[PDB]
Amino acid sequence: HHHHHHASKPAPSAEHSYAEGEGLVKVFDNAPAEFTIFAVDTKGVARTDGGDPFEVAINGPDGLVVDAKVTDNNDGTYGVVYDAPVEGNYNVNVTLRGNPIKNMPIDVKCIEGANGEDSSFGSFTFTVAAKNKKGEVKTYGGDKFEVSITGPAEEITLDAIDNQDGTYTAAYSLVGNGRFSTGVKLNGKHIEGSPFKQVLGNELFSTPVWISQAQGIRAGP
Template structure:
């Protein structure tokens, strides 16, 4: 169907015509002057969809099988031929829990997605564009163990069975002889919530883990290297409230 364009003058003898296509596919543009077609009119154009997820290219080591657990990996998303939208990334670990990822916009129509698979098993990587899955999404990626966790040693006051609320505790993991890999840890409370912790790579073959329990109860601590359990690294600590200090008073009676 015909739809008139919006025409406005821009300088002497110059006009600008604006229109918004309402559908994709072939369109014909008729330009007339004094009710007669100008040279080369009509013009035939092809209107493309606003975005085309099937033209997205996803590639890189982060979507291929055999990724080593606990080590950072990445993949690329090329949207240059796919129209104007933003990619949406959702990564789930073997337990179905979300895995944090970092998306870097290279400002040229490509993106770099960085994530670290902490666990061994199958990861599902969902890549959507405009809410629609791209080709081959979700990507089913197998993560493999790496290193030798039996060569790791743990120490520190954070492995003591009895702890107090509000105190910061630390665990040191020595990985000097364990080979390639990294330390990961998860601390879960009796309520099923994950406790925040900081993992510091000292870059000398040791790691320091810091955590502060804020509520009383039992906490399950699981420490892994290269996606595998460290011997003695799966244990429970009991956190109790601090005992209130009792005020002791003494009295002296004098008799006359």
């Protein structure tokens, strides 16, 4: 950050420096997560340069701990990157000189991106080929579900890790045993067979140009 000298700078206030992503912590099995540290000193005016002695520390379950990458932005702020090694909680702990800040410290569960968020976790399935829900083969058959909500899909929410792999969701229900005769064809021909128009009519309908005289009878007079 600073280069027109090196001899004197203020040490930030842990009373006033603090930290944000954009909202609150969210951390994944399949990616790191990031946040930023804003720096402020004795009267609440931001830091006028950088390279202050911050630290970030990322704890998991039992006895797991990893030191996180602070980096100075050249502006009075710092970028930080971190990860959650276990499908479980991680914990995020931030320090200035030897002192805490706010927003941090904080705990955060580790999940596969959006897989199993709201409301896509509640997505319809037969229990088929496995102890719960779908089987792990893409095409386990001819239909993803059989429906228990009423109305058309204009009014039914879809929410998925992908719109061709996931399916609709709903959390509303009455007391009963309702259904409609449908789902989402996974494979195979929707309504089976072929359409056709009726013929009415058959032969014959046409007759002789006259009915012939079979005899004359009358003999010699």
